[PDB]
Each structure stands twice: as C-alpha cells, then as structure tokens.
Symmetry: C2
Subunit: 217 residues, 2 copies
C-alpha cells in the first residue's frame, strides 16, 4: 500500500493521488506539518534529494513527480502500448504539467497578482492547450487521447481541466469535444469515486495550507 | 538528420545537443533570431504547444525537453535495460535538471542577484546533489551511474557539472569519485569530440543571446 509523503494539501502530490486513484490503487498518507517532521524524513535518508513528493511504493522511495507518475503508469498500463504511443502521452503530459503549474503556483502569489494570473491561465489554456486536445479528439473520435485507452495523459488533462474550471468555470465552453471527454472520463468508476466524497482527493489550498507550507520550508 | 529549432545559444536545447552528441548522432540547427521567425514556426503548426525546443526527428516534431530526451535515450540505449534501471535514471535525471535550472535561469537575473545565485548553486550542488552521486559511484565502483553503461543520467550529470565548474571551478573538490567519473566520461570519444572544437556545443550565453532571447519573446 503506497505511502505518500507530503503536507496535507494538493500541491504537486495531487497528480499522484489522481493517478493512483484512477488506477484504482488504494494508498496512504503521512502528512508533513513541520520543518522538523521534514527533518527527520531527510535525516532518515528517505528523500533521495531532500525533498517531497516522496512516495513509498514497491519497496522504493520514489521522488520526482514526473518520475513517480511514470512509474505508476508503467505499473498500470497508463503508459500506452508502444513507443509512438508512449511518446505522445509523454509530450501531452509534459505540456499539461506546464499549464497545471500555474495552478500550482497560484496560491503563493501576491493576491494582487493572483488575479492577473487567472486571466493568464485562461488564455494559455484557451490558446495553447485546449485546442490541441480538442483537435486530437475531434480527429479520431475516441474517448481517449491516445490508443483508445486511458493513459496518463488523460488523467493529468482531466485533473487540470477541472482545476481550471474551479477558477474559470466556463473555460471549456468553446470545447465541446473536451467537454464530452471530460464527462465520460469523470464517469470512470475509479475516478467517479475519487470525485465523490471521502476520497483522498485534496481541495483547493487555503490560507492554512499555505502557511503550513511556508512553515515546513 | 535531426533538426533543432532554437535560438543560437545554450538555453534548454543544450541537453539535447549533449545527448545527441554522446549518442554520436549528427544533427542540424535552425536558429531563431526573431519574433517573426518564431511566428512562422508557430504559424506553420510546427510547435505542438507553440514553443521551442522543437526537434524534428524521425519524422516527428518533438517538443518538451524531457520528452525529447526520453525519446532519444530510448532510441539509443541511454535509458537502461529495465524498469528498475529506467526508474533510477529517470529520477537522477529529473533531480539534475532541477539543479541545471539554476544555470539556465542565471543569465536572466538582475546582475546583483546573479551573484547570490552562484553561491546558491554551489550550496545545492554540494549539499543536495553531488553527494548522492558520489555515494552511488562510490558504492559500486562502476564508471556509470546506472547498469555499467552510459545512460541519460550520466550525460545530464556531466553536462551540469561542467557547467557548474564554469562558474565554480572547484565545486568538485570534495568529490574525488565525481572527479574521476567526470574525467572518464569526458574521455568517451563522442563526448571527447563534443568537448573539442567545432562541435555544436554552445557557449555560455552572452549579452547578445539574452537580448535576442528577449527579442524573440
């Protein structure tokens, strides 16, 4: 049973929860709340590079989010069936992660900048990303980005889109394919559950989380 | 023959040149110098997500540096021989990239901050990274980080270490294993060449590059 190390919040660990969940893998969590708990962690030589996310899985202590996600994907058929597949998934993933980031950084912005920034997400999404995906989808008619099966790209995309919708509720408006895709995915049972209550799915970060994060580091 | 799109400078494309070179793969370059050349590129629908690096390879237009490096690695046995291997390489790579970044951002700093920042690289390297590697090496006695063969992790590490040494010439001092490793690697012919003159190996970014970069974007 995979163990997740991280503060209790979304952060960067979210995508991990997301994948795990989708894979229908149950896992546990050990929360950081202090610099000190962190210290012990590092002190124990648990964090390969002194930082979290760290995930204990398959007798390993994985670090590096991308690294981790790739592991799990590979452990559960979320990584395609060949190089070409793999390759796409990969790029889709990296690109998305780039957008997701804005979300990730958001909370630590100077409230004033927070706003400007929302507007910016909106534009990148609309302009840079959503279109790519819409097209892909539009052009193969399948319910998955790649190879007619759920992949890592789908989960990150989903993750992100929702997250974005939390800030810009209508962002999808011009992307009827993306809308459909989103719906269906969310219907996948694992996901459906994850989305439901009492999931390890974290909420949008609050003042506290931030504080704490600032505290731990 | 792979074609590299990017301004004429190191930037993030460097690691690509590095890997290509090490793989002993010849490739070409198309330089960006203007917003406009960029526009056409995007206009043509060449940049999957509107940005560079972009690399034309194997009839593809790869984008996302990590994405690309993984491709090439996979095309040339720089990615290990199994999941466990792969997995390490991956993490080593991600971690290194994190350090390399400092280098990457460096030039665009307010000269005043540039200095503070050097000091910081020094510390992270010394404290966070170098030690991990030294240990690894120290503990298996091999000339490669992973599986007794050159991998992607080795190239990025090399890349970075040198780059760092360009700013903090003695950074390696306390890491006799890392020193040895570095030497030997640099002796690998491909590399040796890459390091020699008339290689596609770019130099440390100058005022111009910066300017240009600022210009293109």
């Amino acid at each position: 049973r995979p163990k997740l190390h991280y503060p209790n919040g979304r952060g960067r660990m979210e995508s991990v929860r997301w994948v795990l969940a989708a894979a229908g893998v149950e896992f546990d969590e050990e929360f950081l709340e202090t610099k000190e708990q962190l210290y012990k962690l590092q002190d124990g030589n648990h964090l390969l590079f002194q930082q979290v996310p760290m995930v204990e899985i398959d007798g390993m202590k994985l670090v590096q989010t991308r690294s981790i996600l790739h592991y799990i994907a590979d452990k559960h058929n979320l990584f395609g069936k060949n190089l070409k597949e793999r390759t796409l998934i990969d790029m889709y993933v990296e690109g998305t992660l780039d957008l997701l980031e804005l979300l990730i950084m958001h909370p630590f912005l100077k409230p004033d900048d927070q706003q400007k920034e929302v507007v910016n997400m909106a534009q990148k999404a609309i302009i840079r990303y959503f279109p790519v995906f819409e097209k892909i989808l539009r052009g193969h008619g399948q319910s998955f980005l790649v190879g007619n099966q759920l992949s890592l790209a789908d989960v990150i995309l989903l993750q992100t889109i929702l997250a974005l919708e939390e800030k810009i509720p209508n962002i999808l408006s011009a992307f009827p394919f993306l809308q459909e895709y989103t719906v269906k995915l969310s219907n996948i049972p694992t996901i459906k559950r994850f989305l439901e209550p009492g999931s390890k799915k974290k909420p949008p970060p609050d003042e506290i989380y931030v504080r704490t994060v600032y505290n731990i580091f």
